[PDB]
Design a protein around this ligand. Structure first.
Ligand SMILES: Nc1ncc([C@H]2CC[C@H](NC(=O)[C@@H]3C=CCn4c(=O)n(CCS(=O)(=O)c5ccccc5)c(=O)n43)CC2)[nH]1
Ligand code: NA
Ligand code: NA
Lengths: 10, 278
């Protein structure tokens, strides 16, 4: 449901 | 220090659209409304890394600590037991699902601290946990900590009939999901009424809030709102204080049922203790 978040956050 | 003074309202001497309702009760989310931008700068989103999902609400109490409900991280009967590497904390959000570029700040957790006496076996008594951020978040117009009550703030505001405010991205009905952060102002309810509404054993670490089936106003926290803040504005110094944490309730917004909140002041000693012990 969520827009992807900056990969660096994972 | 600067706690509970919102950059976009108190600081510029602007009032949000429903605060008068709070203040007017001090004797001068289901069924909420969309929050205004920067209305709840301390509202934090507990985010699951994988799958990527909203776990719970939470609140910023300093530049490095987040307060939430312990049942948000640990609930063995549902095989719930999150580690700091399991979650992400998202601060300064408005929109529930979109990544608010240049507005929100996403943080990693350093340590999770659950109340040692959190009673998950019976009634979620002492449902509180602290999460310390890997790095301090920088305050802004949309990110700002709430104040923790002191004994005399707790004393004068925590009264039946006095309204508090709950915010969250939680379900819109027991049986809907907002796109934007929702608000609802609810009255604190007399403890006997709280007790008489449930079979569960109510402890002093709790308070309930909501309207009476007769009062003719509705509203309640719901799924996904868990761990969020129940706050009040002090009419003495104009600051916002977190009195409660969304804990538990039977259904959402049922007639003759109330939401139950972790009594932040009662557990403030544990909060201080872990904050300057780590
Ligand atoms: N009205 C209202 N406002 C906010 C809400 C809540 C609606 C749902 C959420 N709360 C929960 O998922 C918690 C957490 C763990 C266990 N659990 C239960 O089994 N019950 C429900 C069963 S119970 O109430 O008999 C119970 C209480 C305490 C421990 C176990 C069971 C319950 O309420 N909880 C978030 C706020 N409701
Ligand atoms: Na009872
Ligand atoms: Na109700």
């Amino acid at each position: 449901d969520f827009e992807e978040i900056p990969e660096e956050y994972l | 220090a600067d706690c509970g003074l919102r950059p976009l309202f108190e600081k510029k001497s602007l009032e949000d659209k429903t605060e008068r309702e709070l203040l007017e009760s001090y004797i001068d989310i289901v069924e909420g409304s969309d929050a205004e931008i920067g209305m709840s700068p301390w509202q934090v989103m507990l985010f699951r890394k994988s799958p990527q999902e909203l776990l719970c609400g939470a609140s910023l109490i300093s530049d490095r600590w987040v307060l939430t409900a312990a049942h948000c991280l640990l609930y063995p009967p549902w095989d719930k037991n999150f580690t700091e590497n399991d979650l992400l904390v998202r601060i300064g959000k408005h929109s529930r699902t979109r990544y608010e570029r240049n507005i929100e700040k996403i943080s990693m957790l350093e340590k999770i601290y659950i109340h040692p006496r959190y009673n998950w076996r019976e009634n979620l008594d002492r449902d509180i946990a602290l999460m310390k951020l890997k790095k301090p978040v920088a305050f802004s117009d949309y990110i700002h900590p709430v104040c923790l009550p002191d004994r005399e703030t707790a004393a004068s505001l925590l009264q039946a009939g006095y309204k508090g405010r709950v915010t969250g991205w939680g379900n819109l009905k027991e049986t809907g999901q907002p796109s934007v952060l929702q608000v609802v102002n609810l009255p604190i309810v007399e403890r006997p009424v709280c007790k008489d509404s449930t079979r569960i054993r109510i402890t002093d670490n709790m308070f309930c809030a909501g309207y009476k089936p007769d009062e003719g106003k509705r509203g309640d926290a719901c799924e996904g709102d868990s761990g969020g803040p129940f706050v009040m504005k002090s009419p003495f110094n104009n600051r916002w204080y977190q009195m409660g944490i969304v804990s538990w309730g039977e259904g959402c917004d049922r007639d003759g049922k109330y939401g139950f909140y972790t009594h932040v002041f009662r557990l403030k000693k544990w909060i201080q203790k872990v904050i300057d012990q780590f």
